[PDB]
Amino acid sequence: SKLMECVNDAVQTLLQ
Amino acid sequence: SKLMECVNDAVQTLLQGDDKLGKVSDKSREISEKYIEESQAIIQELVKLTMEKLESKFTKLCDLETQLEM
Amino acid sequence: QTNPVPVTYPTDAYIPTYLPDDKVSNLADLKKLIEMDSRLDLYLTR
Amino acid sequence: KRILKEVILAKKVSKVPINNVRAFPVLQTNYNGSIPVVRA
Amino acid sequence: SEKKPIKISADFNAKAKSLGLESKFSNATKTALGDPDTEIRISARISNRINELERLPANLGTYSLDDCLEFITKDDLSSRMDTFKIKALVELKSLKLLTKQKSIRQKLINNVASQAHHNIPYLRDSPFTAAAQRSVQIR
Amino acid sequence: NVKKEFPVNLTIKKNVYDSAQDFNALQDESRNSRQI
Amino acid sequence: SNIPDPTLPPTEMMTRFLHPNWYALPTTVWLKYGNYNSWAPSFNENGTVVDSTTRGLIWLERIGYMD
Amino acid sequence: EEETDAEDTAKLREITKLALQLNSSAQKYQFFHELSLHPRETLTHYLWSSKQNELVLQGDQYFNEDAARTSDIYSNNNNDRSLMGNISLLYSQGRL
Amino acid sequence: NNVTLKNLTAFQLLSQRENICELLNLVESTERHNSIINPERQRMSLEEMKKMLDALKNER
Amino acid sequence: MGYYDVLAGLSALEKSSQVVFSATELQQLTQKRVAVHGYLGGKVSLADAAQVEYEVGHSLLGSYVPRQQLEALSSVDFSHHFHRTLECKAALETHDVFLA
Amino acid sequence: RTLPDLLPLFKTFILPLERIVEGLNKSSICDSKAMDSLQMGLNALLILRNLAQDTDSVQILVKDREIKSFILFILKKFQCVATGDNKWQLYEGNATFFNELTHYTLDLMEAISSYI
């Protein structure tokens, strides 16, 4: 749901 | 406790890739700088408290000197 | 008294020695103050 | 019970589920022993 | 939702809860069977069932509807006269031997818990259990 | 390199609301005055 | 048989049950030498499971910030 | 005398609390510095330690008088049979 | 005030999880970080240091 | 006790017509836990257990009958006993109240 | 003494502990085999100390260069921790282990202190 959204957004911000 | 499963999966995906670790290292470096600032603040307050302690013991020393003269 | 009376709250704590000496610049002063406090305690108790 | 009875009786259901214990309790004759007691 | 979904504070009971570990600082969990009210209620129900079972007649044969193929001639004995009597007796006796089962169960549970740190791998292999078992054996 | 439940012996138990529908073996010959 | 009736108290099993996962491991001792005795051994950590600083951090988190 | 003792004790305890806070901050700094030095090893260690600690924290859940008084944990349908399997041994030792 | 295996493991796991969640920037700890720093306490301590320094300066 | 109970009693016996109700008769007919055993824990003193009152009630032959005694009982006498106490009790109670 | 060739097994369990302790200044116990080797080393060390509490056993222990070299290695690591050297800095996540280690070593030293 939204948890996966938040986690993947955080990971993408970390990797970029 | 469901967020932590997603976090663990994210960390595992991070371990899967190759060119992903440099950004992790840089972010952790910035966080470490934050924490050394915090520790500096704590050390300054500790210095203040020890100063107060020393002042009290200095008054004690003065009383002891009076006793020795007696 | 002949024993140090075990208590329930922490009575002391080490000071970490793995911090970078460049960034933390007031550890030397804190250690000097601790040494002076110990000396005052010795003198009073004697 | 009355509602279900009148629903089934009016044939307002396609099929009726038939699951019954194929036995049922019943009393049983109860005779005594004929060998007399010694009664020490 | 958009911002950080945790927001740790200086409470350590909201901080621990927000990260999953909420009950992990209490000794034992909360259950329903620990109150005397529910115990009295369960005991009442059990006593009522035992009363009903004991008020049954002894001569409690059962006609099985498959005795047709067994051409009983009023002298033979039906091979299924005691099927509801056996079930009634089984239920009654099982309801009367409840405390015995409880005692054996608690003996098993105690004797399997006392050896957790010696029989379960992920408990025996943690550094803290190993450190404690070493600390006990310090000569 | 399922939950098996205790049997529900329904044929043994008695009707709670209208006990005039139990099998004749389970009824009590005391409401129609047939004891004695 | 000697087996009692199932309605007689007690009726609970785990009323005095203790799992080993809560057995109060050994930790630091935190001795106290007077008031002006600062050059004195404060701890006594011989058969401890966890060292002194970690025990102090546990105390700080759970007790020191209870207020 | 009692006032002086209480005051000195309170001051010493405040100083010790501040020192423990300093230790906490320093340990967090050291963790993040070590992570910045060797990310892969620290992350693998984190994953393994988290898995092990979660396994440990789930070692006493069926010991609460609810799992004990009902026939669930004693059933054979349990894939893990770490409870009933002991019976034989426990019977041979006579303890049971 | 008591320490058991469960408490120790829970404490260590909580610390680890907090650190990791901070790495991914999934946590906002402004309250804790400003109660530990406490800039009001910083100003108070700084003024106390200044007063003590002036006292030591003027006694000569 | 109850009007219909009185009628069922008077009809069980065949002396139902030999009774006549009055006005008042009709108007009134219409209206901790001490551990006893020790199978699970540490038993309390036997004196404390004796101080408490026991009431099984649900069973018929009490909570215990020795093996030899039960094995050597008489079934006819106990069948008649249960017929007198469990089923014919209302008729006998009515015969105690009415019918002199 | 009564059981010779008992000390060699303990030494086989104890020297990898020396290697691990040298590698203990960073997160290096990621795997379960590493933890198992570390715990076996600690258990063997405690066994050695408990035996060294006796005269014959400590007499046999003194006549062994490996054990004395290991004790000296652990003591030099402790000195490096104590004086606050920048060469080898203990990673606090491992402190627990180190703690126990140090204690056992010192006990051993105490015993053999009578024979040097």
Q: Which of E49, E63, E84 to mutate to test the interface with F (most CBs of F within 10 A)?
A: E84
Contacts of E107 (CB under 8 A, 6+ apart): H95, H96
DSSP-derived secondary structure for C1-46: --S----SS---------S-TTT--SHHHHHHHHHHHHHHHHHHH-
CA distance C24 to C30: 11
Subunits in contact with chain H (3 or more CB pairs closer than 8 Å): B, C, E, F, G, I, K
Domain ranges in chain B are 1-70
Subunits in contact with chain A (3 or more CB pairs closer than 8 Å): B, E, I
Is-contact B61 C40, C-beta < 8 A? yes
Is-contact E44 D9, C-beta < 8 A? no
Contacts with H75 from chain F: Cβ below 8 Å:
3-4
Give the one of D23, D28, D29 whose C-beta lies nearest to E83's C-beta: D23
From the CA of K46, how many Å to the nearest CA of chain E? 8
Cross-chain Cβ contact D28/E83 below 8 Å: no
Is-contact H56 I5, C-beta < 8 A? yes
DSSP-derived secondary structure for H33-77: HHHHH-HHHHHHHHHHHHHHHHHHHTSSTT-SSHHHHSSSTT-TT
CA distances from K85 to C18, E112, K73, K80, K88 (A): 9, 49, 15, 5, 7
Which residue of H lies nearest to G57 if distances are taken between CA atoms? H20
Residue E63, helix vs strand vs coil: strand
Q: Which two tokens stand for residue H88?
A: 């034989």
E39: nearest Cα among J51, H64, J32, J48: J32
Find tokens 């700084």 and name the residue. I46
The rounded Cα C41 to chain-centroid distance in angstroms is: 12
Cross-chain Cβ contact C18/H13 below 8 Å: no
Q: Which two tokens stand for residue J36?
A: 């006893």
* Cβ neighbours, 10 Å, residue D22: 9
- C-alpha torsion sign, points J95, J98, J99, J100: positive
Subunits in contact with chain G (3 or more CB pairs closer than 8 Å): C, E, H, I, J, K
H39: nearest Cα among C18, B6, K90, B11: B11
CA distance K10 to K42: 10
Is-contact G28 E60, C-beta < 8 A? no
Domain ranges in chain J are 1-100
Which residue of D lies nearest to E64 if distances are taken between CA atoms? D23
I37: nearest Cα among C15, C25, B40, C29: B40
Contacts of H3 (CB under 8 A, 6+ apart): none
The rounded Cα H61 to chain-centroid distance in angstroms is: 14
Give the one of G30, G39, G52 whose C-beta lies nearest to C6's C-beta: G30
CA distance J50 to G3: 18
Is-contact K108 K48, C-beta < 8 A? yes
CA distance K52 to K60: 9
E1–A contact, CB cutoff 8 A: yes
Contacts with F24 from chain E: Cβ below 8 Å:
none
Q: Find the distance separating the first CA and the last CA of chain C, reported in whole Å.
A: 18
Cross-chain Cβ contact H30/K29 below 8 Å: no
CA angle C33, C38, C41 (to 5 degrees): 125
Give the one of B11, B44, B48 whose C-beta lies nearest to I20's C-beta: B11
Q: Strand locations in J1-100, DSSP E? A: none
| Max Cα–Cα distance, chain C, nearest Å | 46
Beta-bridged to residue E62, according to DSSP, are D25
DSSP state at residue J45: P
Three-state SS sequence of chain K: CCCCCCHHHHHHHHHHHHHHHHCCCCCCCCCHHHHHHHHHHHHHHHHHHHHHCCHHHHHHHHCCHHHHHHHHHHHHHHHHHHHCCCCCCCCHHHHHHHHHHHHHHHHHHHHHHHHC
Is-contact G38 H1, C-beta < 8 A? no
B20–A contact, CB cutoff 8 A: yes
Cross-chain Cβ contact F11/E84 below 8 Å: yes
Residue H78, helix vs strand vs coil: coil
Cross-chain Cβ contact F26/D27 below 8 Å: no
Resolution given for this structure, in angstroms? 20.0
Cross-chain Cβ contact F29/J91 below 8 Å: no
* Cβ neighbours, 10 Å, residue B54: 13
Q: Which of A1, A2, A3, A9 to mutate to test the interface with B (most CBs of B within 10 A)?
A: A3
The rounded Cα E93 to chain-centroid distance in angstroms is: 18
Helix axes B21-69, C27-45, angle to 10 degrees: 30
From the CA of F7, how many Å to the nearest CA of chain H? 14
HSE-CB at J62 with a 13 A cutoff on CA atoms is 7
Cross-chain Cβ contact B15/H47 below 8 Å: yes
K89–C contact, CB cutoff 8 A: yes
CA distance E133 to E78: 66
Helix axes K95-112, E127-136, angle to 10 degrees: 30
CA distances from F32 to C44, F29, I31, J89 (A): 104, 6, 80, 15
Q: Which of E8, E19, E23 to mutate to test the interface with B (most CBs of B within 10 A)?
A: E19
Q: Which of D20, D28, D29 to mutate to test the interface with E (most CBs of E within 10 A)?
A: D28
DSSP state at residue E23: G
Q: Find the distance separating the first CA and the last CA of chain H, reported in whole Å.
A: 61
**Please, after which residues is chain I broken with C–N above 2.5 Å?**
none
CA distance C28 to C40: 18
Is-contact E128 I8, C-beta < 8 A? yes
CA distances from K101 to C33, J35, K81 (A): 32, 50, 13
Contacts with K106 from chain G: Cβ below 8 Å:
none
CA distance B46 to H23: 12
Indicate the helix (H) or strand (E) that contains D25.
strand D24-25
Q: Which of I5, I6, I14, I16 to mutate to test the interface with G (most CBs of G within 10 A)?
A: I5
- One-letter amino acid for residue J11 of the chain: S
Subunits in contact with chain C (3 or more CB pairs closer than 8 Å): B, G, H, K
DSSP-derived secondary structure for J59-76: SSS-S---HHHHHT--HH
Cis peptide before C10 (omega within 30 of 0): no
Indicate the helix (H) or strand (E) that contains D24.
strand D24-25
Cross-chain Cβ contact D26/E61 below 8 Å: yes
Cross-chain Cβ contact H47/B12 below 8 Å: yes
E94: nearest Cα among E138, E55, E49: E49
Which residue of J lies nearest to G1 if distances are taken between CA atoms? J64
DSSP state at residue E62: E
H50: nearest Cα among I12, G43, C24: I12
From the CA of G3, how many Å to the nearest CA of chain C? 48
Contacts with C31 from chain B: Cβ below 8 Å:
none
H94–E contact, CB cutoff 8 A: no
Contacts with C17 from chain K: Cβ below 8 Å:
84, 89
Three-state SS sequence of chain G: CCCCCCCCCCCCCCCCCCCCCCCCCCCCCCCCCCCCCCCCCCCCCCCCCCCHHHHHHHHHHHHHCCC
Which residue of B lies nearest to E23 if distances are taken between CA atoms? B1
C27–H contact, CB cutoff 8 A: no
